[PDB]
Swiss-Prot record, chains A, B:
This is ATP-dependent molecular chaperone HSP82. Its main location: cytoplasm. The gene is HSP82. Belongs to the heat shock protein 90 family. Present with 444943 molecules/cell in log phase SD medium. Molecular chaperone that promotes the maturation, structural maintenance and proper regulation of specific target proteins involved in cell cycle control and signal transduction. Undergoes a functional cycle that is linked to its ATPase activity. The nucleotide-free form of the dimer is found in an open conformation in which the N-termini are not dimerized and the complex is ready for client protein binding. The TPR repeat-binding motif mediates interaction with TPR repeat-containing proteins like the co-chaperones AHA1, CDC37, CNS1, CPR6, CPR7, HCH1, SBA1, SSE1 and STI1. CNS1, CPR6, CPR7 and STI1.
Length: 214, 214
């Protein structure tokens, strides 16, 4: 199909503009937030499967997978968690997506460290520390695969997905990294960031590395 | 769109049935043939770009990339070479695809080693040594992305591609490995097979490895 365009709730647009523009030092913290969200989605599908085991069959493996795509300056973070339907992507990432958004911004003004973002329920938006564009590609058992896309402007698009690999079930965050943040494409940097901030994750974290054979 | 189905030329079906069923020992040779085809397609796009440099811009990097997908028992061999349009996939892989096909089978009967397959121009079909199903996904600058699929039966299908990652330009052979050939998903096995049979390749060969972070 065509893309549909949606307006963000005003506090969300304010949160994003602030973060995409910040000179804050500790940007690496975006990866902890995206692994935590990935781990929550995997919790929800595992929890859901307790009474409905067939929900697992669209993707029996439970994992988080990180894929640097250095040639496109993209970093992907995939999970096989519960995924979001079209209406979920629309509601959860932007149109309500509310709640701690304004509390967080107020805490920032008073000097809170950008790293509390997650305790306010809005750590998804920390991706704009290292990316100036994101596509969230998601497949819920309840809906077709969709793409939600934002560039931290006041509106986002949602498009039926006829261009990306089929996710059996779950979500890919595809981060279009800023030119100064290309370090997050490097295998050593990634590992160091995960060991530091994500020690207790119930699910395997996989890193997809491309090496020339010689 | 829907799938279209096409009949193979009769000698091709005869070639495939023989190979999918052979007890021959040296199956590893399929990888040399698929890297050679990949290298030929990259030669043709490089040669073509000599007088039409813009043909490179849909994918400026020239590479061969091998991606084991152990969970699906798939091995992928990708190149960014010239790719095939729908009519090319139909003509080149099956409906004419002729020429050395019958000569090769006659040489086999007389005791030729399955490994001469490439000097008869039909080494593509060597994939059926290790796979009982293949999808060829291809994107020519001249056409949309298409999927050609065969299971060594007498007919194949060609489908407009709305399910796979976008190839900028080139071809993916997606091999659905036989249960006894899963060794070709292993990083050490692959490297050993390339060093042995593909020493002189002008293009980088990349191996995509997935490792758990601990
Ligand atoms: C958590 N859920 C599953 C759906 C989440 C439902 C609760 C509302 C969450 C609001 C924030 C959005 C979110 O966490 C979605 C998500 C993100 Cl951002 C991610 O990086 C990885 C994911 O697997 C998901 C996701 O699909
Ligand atoms: C060689 N060409 C480019 C298109 C080839 C034209 C000449 C006719 C070739 C007939 C065999 C089919 C073929 O080689 C196609 C192909 C295969 Cl099988 C492959 O494994 C990788 C590829 O990049 C190609 C391909 O697209």
């Amino acid at each position: 199909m065509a893309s549909e365009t949606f307006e963000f709730q005003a506090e969300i647009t304010q949160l994003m503009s602030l973060i995409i523009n910040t000179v804050y030092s500790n940007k690496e913290i975006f990866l902890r937030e995206l692994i935590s969200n990935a781990s929550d989605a995997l919790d929800k599908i595992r929890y859901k499967s307790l009474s409905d085991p067939k929900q697992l069959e669209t993707e029996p493996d439970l994992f988080i997978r990180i894929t640097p795509k250095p040639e496109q300056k993209v970093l992907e973070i995939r999970d096989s968690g519960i995924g979001m339907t079209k209406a979920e992507l629309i509601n959860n990432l932007g149109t309500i997506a509310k709640s701690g958004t304004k509390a967080f911004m107020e805490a920032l003004s008073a000097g809170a460290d950008v790293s509390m973002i997650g305790q306010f329920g809005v750590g998804f938006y920390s991706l704009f520390l290292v990316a100036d564009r994101v596509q969230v590609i998601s497949k819920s058992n309840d809906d077709e695969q969709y793409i939600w896309e934002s560039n931290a402007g006041g509106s986002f698009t949602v498009t039926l997905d006829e261009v990306n690999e089929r996710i059996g079930r779950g979500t890919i965050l595809r981060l279009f990294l800023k030119d100064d943040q290309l370090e997050y494409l490097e295998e050593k940097r990634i590992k160091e960031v995960i060991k530091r901030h994500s020690e207790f994750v119930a699910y395997p974290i996989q890193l997809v590395v491309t090496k020339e054979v010689e």
